[PDB]
Amino acid sequence: GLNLNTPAYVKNAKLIAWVADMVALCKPDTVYWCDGSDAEYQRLCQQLVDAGTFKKLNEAKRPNSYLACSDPSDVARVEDRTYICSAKEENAGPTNNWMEPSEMRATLQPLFDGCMRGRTMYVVPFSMGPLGSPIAHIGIELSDSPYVAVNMKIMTRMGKAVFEVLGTEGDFVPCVHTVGAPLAEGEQDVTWPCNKTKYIVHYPETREIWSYGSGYGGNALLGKKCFALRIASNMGRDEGWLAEHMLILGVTNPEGKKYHVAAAFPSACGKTNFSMLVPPAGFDGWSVTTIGDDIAWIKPAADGKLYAINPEAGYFGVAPGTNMLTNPNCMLSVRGNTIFTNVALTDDGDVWWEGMEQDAPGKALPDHLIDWQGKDWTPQIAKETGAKAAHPNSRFTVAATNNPALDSAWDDPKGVAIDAFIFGGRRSTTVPLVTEARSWVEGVYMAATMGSEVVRRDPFAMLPFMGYNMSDYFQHWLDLGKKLAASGATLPKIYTTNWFRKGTDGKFVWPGYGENMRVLAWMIDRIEGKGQGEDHVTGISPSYEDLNWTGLDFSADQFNTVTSIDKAAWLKELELHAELFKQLEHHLPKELGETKAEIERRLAA
Ligand SMILES: [Mn+2]
């Protein structure tokens, strides 16, 4: 009908009929199709300013940037409200919340019925992956949040170009989102509409994503987690590829040899820092470049290699902790053209977040700020009330092309061949600085059992993002490796890393940040077959002499403190693995049991 305002370039009848069904359900006042243009982005930003959702930052301090502050009830992903509604509960598994699909549809129907009354529905077309490419997938998100529209513009390839790829019959992932705050005639809107009742629902068989009540981050920017991980992991299982919670980086040595690694880190462990790593002193001629900092789509090719693409177009990164010491490439990235969410406002109209004082003379805190809740903030107020100036989950949104270390192949549809996988974690004890798995299966075991500090397990860093049963996902990784090795291929190395072993004084021994290059360089030597290492109960680890210490005062005893293996600690660690496996017993692959038994055998030898 005429009420869809369908542009002429939309030729896809199934898509129009679907938009019509959701407009019939959600009943927005008007329907607007986002063309993705720069002018439209500025218009929507101005609408957000007019509503009070955005404040324009000072154009001298932070050009063409905006600050949004959210309702305190709507500040993060809500995992207890996130559902995998597969036909069978066993295909959701113990790491996912399940509900019978017909029961969830009956639950969501009255909530979405009229949810957009009084609001504009934004039709947000987007490609995950480079446009028109053989490995990209198209999504359409219907949303009543202009905040969602402008952030999706930065985070994805958004707008009119999508429809030339879809053509008249192409498929798309259907996404529906509402803040769940319908407006009556003459009602004054709030600056951050949301609902205390929240649902983030995935129907894997139909690829549907339904989001109700949150306008924040991973709940509402449906391309990032709901599509590019949860739905995408299901597609990869059926089609022979991988959707992973991994950065992708390129590392080039002084001879121009270039390697790519994919690395999964749990929350507060350093994917953005590592993906933008700056080589320290002693690594002249080396360069590290960013393909992606969060999501990897990885497909084996006929040539026996695993090719990864970053399906996103920008960064939606955690702000606190970012400074010129931990991550100068990220700091340079957010110099302008950035949307900041829930960070603090300085007196000169700039932004601030915990950790930025590391760049200030004397590392001094600012005298005064307006915090993410609009309150006066001072160091003394922070001391008295405990309030952080920026919310811990505060964010920047910025285009990938703002990154000075952006890899030249970041949008190459052919992807990059992965030479190694890295699985991080934060462990005060037990886990060495770096360990190389002796085999693919033993690497999958490492990824399956990774944890972060008590110690919480987060297999493959996918605990909140697996689109199906975690144990079947383990099996997918094992089968994929077997099939690759069967074609004669050389499987990528797998490493576990741990930056956070504590010394006898309780401090972190490993300096981390740019010095992580020294561990990465050892991996490179191993990939080339020229690196040495010590074999131990769980794998191979470098000796002190195997790393390049040029430019860092770091002693053998410090290195052995973070890298040496202790049988007593690993006996206790395997007990914790046993607890994890009981929480995951259904369809747990036998190969993981064989790996645990082999570690136990080496511990007793
Ligand atoms: Mn992430």
Numbering used by the authors: 8 to 460, 471 to 622
Give the exact sentences the study uses for this entry.
Conversely, the holo structure and those with PEP alone were in the open conformation. Analysis of these crystals found that there was an open holo form (P212121), an open bound (C2221), and a bound form which could be observed in either the open or closed conformation (P212121). When nucleotide was absent, the enzyme adopted the open complexes and the P‐loop (which binds the nucleotide) was modeled in two conformations. However, a lack of strong density suggested that the loop was sampling other states. In the open conformation of PnPEPCK, both the Ω‐loop and R473 of the hinge region are disordered. In both enzymes, the R‐loops are well‐modeled, and the Ω‐loops are disordered in the open state.
To gain insight into how evolution adapts functional dynamics to low temperature, we have collected a set of kinetic measurements and high‐resolution crystal structures of a psychrophilic GTP‐dependent phosphoenolpyruvate carboxykinase (Polaromonas naphthalenivorans; PnPEPCK—T growth ~ 4–20°C, T opt ~ 20°C) (Jeon et al., 2004). PEPCK is an important metabolic enzyme that catalyzes the bidirectional reaction between oxaloacetic acid (OAA) and phosphoenolpyruvate (PEP) using a phosphoryl donor (GTP, ATP, or PPi, depending on class) (McLeod & Holyoak, 2021). PEPCK has three active site loops: the R‐loop, which coordinates the substrate (OAA, enol‐pyruvate intermediate, or PEP); the P‐loop, which coordinates the nucleotide or PPi; and the Ω‐loop, a flexible lid that is disordered when “open” and orders/closes over the active site after the Michaelis complex is formed. Ω‐loops are non‐regular secondary structure elements that are characterized by a narrow beginning and ending (β‐sheet structure) with an extended medial region resembling the shape of the Greek letter omega. Structural comparisons revealed substitutions in the Ω‐loop that likely increase the entropic cost of loop ordering and reduce enthalpic stabilization, hindering efficient active site closure.
